Design an enzyme around this catalytic site. Structure first.
Site, PDB file in Angstrom:
ATOM      1  N   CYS A   1       0.773  -1.245   0.000  1.00 56.52           N
ATOM      2  CA  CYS A   1       0.000   0.000   0.000  1.00 56.52           C
ATOM      3  C   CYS A   1       0.800   1.289   0.000  1.00 56.52           C
ATOM      4  O   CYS A   1       1.554   1.586   0.934  1.00 56.52           O
ATOM      5  CB  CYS A   1      -1.007   0.009   1.154  1.00 56.52           C
ATOM      6  SG  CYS A   1      -2.009   1.508   1.206  1.00 56.52           S
TER       7      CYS A   1
ATOM      8  N   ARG B   1      -0.289   4.529   2.777  1.00 61.51           N
ATOM      9  CA  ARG B   1      -0.177   4.339   4.213  1.00 61.51           C
ATOM     10  C   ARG B   1       0.149   5.528   5.088  1.00 61.51           C
ATOM     11  O   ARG B   1       0.176   5.382   6.290  1.00 61.51           O
ATOM     12  CB  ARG B   1       0.812   3.220   4.530  1.00 61.51           C
ATOM     13  CG  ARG B   1       0.223   1.843   4.427  1.00 61.51           C
ATOM     14  CD  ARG B   1       1.266   0.783   4.747  1.00 61.51           C
ATOM     15  NE  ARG B   1       2.298   0.667   3.713  1.00 61.51           N
ATOM     16  CZ  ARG B   1       3.391  -0.086   3.830  1.00 61.51           C
ATOM     17  NH1 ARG B   1       3.594  -0.791   4.937  1.00 61.51           N
ATOM     18  NH2 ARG B   1       4.271  -0.155   2.829  1.00 61.51           N
TER      19      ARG B   1
ATOM     20  N   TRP C   1      -9.332   5.984  -1.097  1.00 60.84           N
ATOM     21  CA  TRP C   1      -9.666   6.633  -2.357  1.00 60.84           C
ATOM     22  C   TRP C   1      -8.673   6.180  -3.409  1.00 60.84           C
ATOM     23  O   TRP C   1      -7.649   5.595  -3.075  1.00 60.84           O
ATOM     24  CB  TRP C   1      -9.676   8.145  -2.233  1.00 60.84           C
ATOM     25  CG  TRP C   1      -8.483   8.698  -1.627  1.00 60.84           C
ATOM     26  CD1 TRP C   1      -7.304   8.974  -2.249  1.00 60.84           C
ATOM     27  CD2 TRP C   1      -8.334   9.109  -0.277  1.00 60.84           C
ATOM     28  NE1 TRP C   1      -6.428   9.544  -1.369  1.00 60.84           N
ATOM     29  CE2 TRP C   1      -7.034   9.642  -0.144  1.00 60.84           C
ATOM     30  CE3 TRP C   1      -9.175   9.087   0.838  1.00 60.84           C
ATOM     31  CZ2 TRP C   1      -6.549  10.155   1.065  1.00 60.84           C
ATOM     32  CZ3 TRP C   1      -8.695   9.600   2.050  1.00 60.84           C
ATOM     33  CH2 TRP C   1      -7.391  10.127   2.148  1.00 60.84           C
TER      34      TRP C   1
ATOM     35  N   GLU D   1      -4.207   3.481 -11.006  1.00 61.30           N
ATOM     36  CA  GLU D   1      -5.017   2.287 -10.791  1.00 61.30           C
ATOM     37  C   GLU D   1      -6.133   2.182 -11.818  1.00 61.30           C
ATOM     38  O   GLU D   1      -6.428   1.086 -12.312  1.00 61.30           O
ATOM     39  CB  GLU D   1      -5.609   2.260  -9.391  1.00 61.30           C
ATOM     40  CG  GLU D   1      -4.623   2.339  -8.251  1.00 61.30           C
ATOM     41  CD  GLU D   1      -5.327   2.109  -6.938  1.00 61.30           C
ATOM     42  OE1 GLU D   1      -5.796   0.980  -6.723  1.00 61.30           O
ATOM     43  OE2 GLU D   1      -5.484   3.057  -6.147  1.00 61.30           O
TER      44      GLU D   1
HETATM   45  C1  HEM Z   1      -5.798   6.306   2.017  1.00 61.93           C
HETATM   46  C2  HEM Z   1      -6.099   6.197   0.518  1.00 61.93           C
HETATM   47  C3  HEM Z   1      -5.446   4.989  -0.145  1.00 61.93           C
HETATM   48  C4  HEM Z   1      -4.726   4.934  -1.308  1.00 61.93           C
HETATM   49  C5  HEM Z   1      -4.352   6.060  -2.283  1.00 61.93           C
HETATM   50  C6  HEM Z   1      -4.342   3.567  -1.494  1.00 61.93           C
HETATM   51  C7  HEM Z   1      -3.619   3.114  -2.594  1.00 61.93           C
HETATM   52  C8  HEM Z   1      -3.232   1.829  -2.851  1.00 61.93           C
HETATM   53  C9  HEM Z   1      -2.530   1.303  -4.017  1.00 61.93           C
HETATM   54  C10 HEM Z   1      -2.083   2.128  -5.219  1.00 61.93           C
HETATM   55  C11 HEM Z   1      -2.387  -0.008  -3.846  1.00 61.93           C
HETATM   56  C12 HEM Z   1      -1.736  -1.023  -4.796  1.00 61.93           C
HETATM   57  C13 HEM Z   1      -2.727  -2.175  -5.118  1.00 61.93           C
HETATM   58  C14 HEM Z   1      -3.255  -2.232  -6.543  1.00 61.93           C
HETATM   59  O1  HEM Z   1      -2.526  -1.896  -7.464  1.00 61.93           O
HETATM   60  O2  HEM Z   1      -4.451  -2.658  -6.662  1.00 61.93           O
HETATM   61  C15 HEM Z   1      -2.961  -0.352  -2.549  1.00 61.93           C
HETATM   62  C16 HEM Z   1      -2.997  -1.608  -1.961  1.00 61.93           C
HETATM   63  C17 HEM Z   1      -3.553  -1.951  -0.719  1.00 61.93           C
HETATM   64  N1  HEM Z   1      -4.199  -1.071   0.134  1.00 61.93           N
HETATM   65 FE1  HEM Z   1      -3.950   0.988   0.137  1.00 61.93          FE
HETATM   66  N2  HEM Z   1      -4.836   2.797  -0.424  1.00 61.93           N
HETATM   67  C18 HEM Z   1      -5.524   3.659   0.396  1.00 61.93           C
HETATM   68  C19 HEM Z   1      -6.168   3.272   1.573  1.00 61.93           C
HETATM   69  C20 HEM Z   1      -6.176   1.998   2.120  1.00 61.93           C
HETATM   70  C21 HEM Z   1      -6.875   1.613   3.362  1.00 61.93           C
HETATM   71  C22 HEM Z   1      -7.733   2.591   4.216  1.00 61.93           C
HETATM   72  C23 HEM Z   1      -6.603   0.296   3.559  1.00 61.93           C
HETATM   73  C24 HEM Z   1      -7.036  -0.686   4.680  1.00 61.93           C
HETATM   74  C25 HEM Z   1      -7.402  -0.053   6.033  1.00 61.93           C
HETATM   75  C26 HEM Z   1      -5.781  -0.131   2.466  1.00 61.93           C
HETATM   76  C27 HEM Z   1      -5.317  -1.394   2.280  1.00 61.93           C
HETATM   77  C28 HEM Z   1      -4.596  -1.857   1.225  1.00 61.93           C
HETATM   78  C29 HEM Z   1      -4.161  -3.214   1.045  1.00 61.93           C
HETATM   79  C30 HEM Z   1      -4.410  -4.363   2.029  1.00 61.93           C
HETATM   80  C31 HEM Z   1      -3.539  -3.275  -0.142  1.00 61.93           C
HETATM   81  C32 HEM Z   1      -2.963  -4.508  -0.769  1.00 61.93           C
HETATM   82  C33 HEM Z   1      -4.112  -5.036  -1.681  1.00 61.93           C
HETATM   83  C34 HEM Z   1      -3.741  -6.279  -2.392  1.00 61.93           C
HETATM   84  O3  HEM Z   1      -2.811  -6.903  -1.867  1.00 61.93           O
HETATM   85  O4  HEM Z   1      -4.351  -6.621  -3.418  1.00 61.93           O
HETATM   86  N3  HEM Z   1      -5.532   0.908   1.600  1.00 61.93           N
HETATM   87  N4  HEM Z   1      -3.471   0.788  -1.987  1.00 61.93           N
HETATM   88  N1  LIG Z   2      -7.018   2.263  -3.106  1.00 59.96           N
HETATM   89  C1  LIG Z   2      -7.315   0.965  -3.050  1.00 59.96           C
HETATM   90  N2  LIG Z   2      -8.106   0.498  -2.085  1.00 59.96           N
HETATM   91  O1  LIG Z   2      -8.690   1.322  -1.114  1.00 59.96           O
HETATM   92  N3  LIG Z   2      -6.833   0.120  -3.950  1.00 59.96           N
HETATM   93  C2  LIG Z   2      -7.127  -1.303  -3.940  1.00 59.96           C
HETATM   94  C3  LIG Z   2      -7.129  -1.888  -5.332  1.00 59.96           C
HETATM   95  C4  LIG Z   2      -8.039  -1.119  -6.309  1.00 59.96           C
HETATM   96  C5  LIG Z   2      -7.927  -1.593  -7.777  1.00 59.96           C
HETATM   97  N4  LIG Z   2      -6.535  -1.374  -8.300  1.00 59.96           N
HETATM   98  C6  LIG Z   2      -8.997  -0.919  -8.652  1.00 59.96           C
HETATM   99  O2  LIG Z   2      -8.749   0.186  -9.151  1.00 59.96           O
HETATM  100  O3  LIG Z   2     -10.068  -1.501  -8.851  1.00 59.96           O
END
Ligand code: HEM
Ligand SMILES: N=C(NO)NCCC[C@H](N)C(=O)O
Ligand code: HEM
Ligand SMILES: C[C@H](O)[C@H](O)[C@H]1CNc2nc(N)[nH]c(=O)c2N1
Ligand SMILES: C[C@H](O)[C@H](O)[C@H]1CNc2nc(N)[nH]c(=O)c2N1
Ligand SMILES: N=C(NO)NCCC[C@H](N)C(=O)O
Ligand SMILES: [Zn+2]
Lengths: 400, 400
Positions: free
Chosen positions: A104, A107, A276, A281
């Site tokens: 993530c 974070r 968000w 993405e």
């Molecule tokens: C605060 C705004 C946030 C942004 C901009 C963000 C952005 C991202 C991005 C770019 C990825 C890469 C995964 C992909 O390419 O699909 C990711 C993965 C992830 N996010 Fe963050 N996220 C946010 C909030 C959160 C929150 C609130 C949580 C959980 C409390 C979270 C949990 C995760 C997890 C667990 C992954 C790994 C998902 C996977 O392994 O497929 N995210 N996020």
């Molecule tokens: N920002 C987040 N989650 O909150 N990303 C999780 C994966 C989203 C996925 N890459 C999509 O655009 O469908």
């Protein structure tokens, strides 16, 4: 062993003293590194550790309170095979799960999470209610707020609560007779499952799927999100007047609902979360991946680029303008969105905050670095150490 | 353990049965992955293994010849502490070193390498001669041919042959009074070493450095490449008429000269190699890295992009046009160059060839994937297993 971590842009170096406390369940060995792999993977001991983390966070480690909680947890486990978390512990654990997520890039906002306690949930109907409220709070008319709704934990001699969908809002993927797919290819299976469960589909390219919610030992039930709850953004380009005529759009809320939350040995199979979007993405992955919407060619053609040769970098130019379309469109619709330059810059700050906080940060280089302009962002030039800490969000087999 | 490796684009999977025979000297462990790290790191046993590889390659394993060579090698080692390779063995080993290179995306051409035996080299003077010849054969007036020149091995009670420069042709980096750098900042150290050894510098932005060559137990000597031997490409853009006015240029031959070649336990501290460029190397990294030529801003500004905000993706647009400049410029000058789409597509073929050949391929995902448009290339969607096989090219401390 405290891995030296160096930033090749500024030349600074740190030592990750936190990795030495990670779980030895990674797929790498001295003989070979399996870090590019999508899928790299006692209750008492895990519980005690989590309780210890909690008491340290409130700065009451070693207190009578701390001691009582330990004995209490052990008594529940020895008496029931599991135990009950307190509300504040749940809120603390949820936030660490996010904090600990190596993949993530968002974070830095980890401490600003809104946990919704849905552990007294009894039916799929109530499940649907909790979900609609989550979507309401989080969406917040476009000023998105990070949140998670935690449903009942996994129980001895009881079926799990599960959300079959991978995200709360997803577009149907309709497989055509001619082998093509109308909609999102990534959603063909779930789409077919909804249909097989009684849903009458809609032949569109952006049809929001119904929720297939499961309560312990029940068949899944179908639930349709009210259109009013699902905020979407139509895509247009600031200068390419014809982009809009493409009829493309994307939903506002990315809410992952198929992962498992693990806190102190306890497992919550249904625990939807959302923040968000980060532009790449949608723009790069969702719209340009060959097996997703796959729109590069049409866009390049409409931009009238030389699609004949690869050295014209037509694919690069189209991709960039599409990412521009997504950013512009979300900013126009006044829906929260962050671009890869800002996203990665904030993560470099988060890394700094964590080195001072815990002496390191678990990060997965391949996921942290954006799918476009990698070396143009600071994280690319940053070495990372990847490991699995707990609490955590983990993958799990699909419920069917 | 035969790691399953899946291609997420087509869904195919294979099993790397080759990694199980790798050298257990990688930095990863089950507790944490250090794969994003730039620097992740008996003669008889190594020699025998290499000799065994060689005989298997010619399909004469178990022959009297094979046996004689084994006994011979052992006799030399037991008698001198080292041993001498045969010409055909050297040619075979050098080729495997390239083939085994996890960070090289241009490995499909591994079998077409021209090895030049420079093992009878006696002085820095002769070393300079072989280098100029290498430059001539390889450059080939723009139709570049991959080659390597192997100088004498590391010896018992003897200094090494070393080429101080990182590459055969490098641009000087002159540190200015005001803290800025005129030229290539990456070459400040070597530049200052050249100056310190008697070189009179030239205050230009693209001044080809002299070679600092070292023969066993000698101070390094300076040698100037004749301008005639160094082919360069001036950069221009197909449409941005003002790009040319920037006076940017890059050399045609990428020849790495600071790495060590290891074959059967033997080490060749001086053994320069070269192939041809992949556009992203020059356009993205060399020209856009903040601590390299750092020209994004200027180009963005000249393109008249909104440098005000990050969401305009001004950095992404300039970077793309610059990569376009590089490709178009080399194609115009008729100098060999390959773009990231073609390069990664060829590597996907190489992976298939090696799966059939050795049942796997050592690859470093972080390096194989290009610094721009990562997900737009097929390698991004390909899982990889990274390990260290022998023979190999390795890094080594700078000779000073
Ligand atoms: C605060 C705004 C946030 C942004 C901009 C963000 C952005 C991202 C991005 C770019 C990825 C890469 C995964 C992909 O390419 O699909 C990711 C993965 C992830 N996010 Fe963050 N996220 C946010 C909030 C959160 C929150 C609130 C949580 C959980 C409390 C979270 C949990 C995760 C997890 C667990 C992954 C790994 C998902 C996977 O392994 O497929 N995210 N996020
Ligand atoms: N920002 C987040 N989650 O909150 N990303 C999780 C994966 C989203 C996925 N890459 C999509 O655009 O469908
Ligand atoms: C044949 C045309 C070739 C192309 C297009 C090519 C391309 C590349 C690219 C894009 C990289 C990534 C490293 C970087 O960004 O600096 C690389 C690395 C590397 N190449 Fe290949 N290369 C070619 C030939 C060769 C040859 C002939 C050899 C040795 C005989 C070789 C040895 C290596 C090694 C050892 C690395 C890793 C360098 C390092 O780790 O710093 N390459 N090459
Ligand atoms: C195999 C490879 O790790 C896989 O394709 C990864 C690479 N990095 C990624 N990074 C992000 N953010 N999202 C992804 O889906 C992926 N896919
Ligand atoms: C820290 C990080 O691994 C480092 O900057 C790497 C990333 N990937 C790379 N990939 C290639 N091809 N070349 C490089 O120099 C690098 N640098
Ligand atoms: N093709 C090769 N080697 O043969 N690439 C590696 C060295 C190139 C280096 N990145 C440069 O442009 O300065
Ligand atoms: Zn690893």
């Amino acid at each position: 062993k405290f891995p030296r971590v160096k930033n090749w842009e500024v030349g600074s170096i740190t030592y990750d003293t936190l990795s030495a406390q990670a779980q030895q369940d990674g797929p790498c060995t001295p003989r070979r590194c399996l870090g590019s792999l999508v899928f790299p993977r006692q209750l008492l001991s895990q519980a005690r550790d989590f309780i210890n983390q909690y008491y340290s966070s409130i700065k009451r480690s070693g207190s009578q309170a701390h001691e009582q909680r330990l004995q209490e947890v052990e008594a529940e486990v020895a008496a029931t095979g599991t135990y009950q978390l307190r509300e504040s512990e749940l809120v603390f654990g949820a936030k660490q799960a996010w904090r600990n997520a190596p993949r993530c890039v968002g974070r830095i906002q980890w401490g600003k999470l809104q946990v919704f306690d849905a552990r007294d949930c009894r039916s799929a109907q109530e499940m649907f209610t909790y979900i609609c409220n989550h979507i309401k709070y989080a969406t917040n008319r476009g000023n998105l707020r990070s949140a998670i709704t935690v449903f009942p934990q996994r129980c001895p001699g009881r079926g799990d609560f599960r959300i079959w969908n991978s995200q709360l809002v997803r577009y149907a993927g309709y497989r055509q007779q001619d082998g093509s797919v109308r909609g999102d290819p990534a959603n063909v299976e779930i789409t077919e499952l909804c249909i097989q469960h009684g849903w009458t589909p809609g032949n569109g390219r952006f049809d929001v799927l119904p929720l297939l919610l499961q309560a312990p030992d029940e068949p899944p039930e179908l639930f349709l999100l009210p259109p009013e709850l699902v905020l979407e953004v139509p895509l247009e380009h600031p200068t390419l007047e014809w982009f809009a005529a493409l009829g493309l759009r994307w939903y506002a809320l990315p809410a992952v609902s198929n992962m498992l939350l693990e806190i102190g040995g306890l497992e919550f199979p249904a625990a939807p979360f959302s923040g968000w979007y980060m532009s790449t993405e949608i723009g790069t992955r969702n719209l340009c991946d060959p097996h997703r919407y796959n729109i590069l060619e049409d866009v390049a053609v409409c931009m009238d680029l030389d699609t004949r040769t690869t050295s014209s970098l037509w694919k690069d130019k189209a991709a960039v303008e599409i990412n521009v379309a997504v950013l512009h469109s979300y900013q126009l619709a006044k829906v929260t969105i962050v671009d890869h330059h800002a996203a990665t810059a904030s993560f470099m700050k988060h890394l700094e905050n964590e080195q001072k906080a815990r002496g390191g940060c678990p990060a997965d280089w391949a996921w942290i670095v954006p799918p476009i302009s990698g070396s143009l962002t600071p994280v690319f030039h940053q070495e990372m150490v990847n490991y699995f800490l707990s609490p955590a969000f983990r993958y799990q087999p699909d419920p069917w």
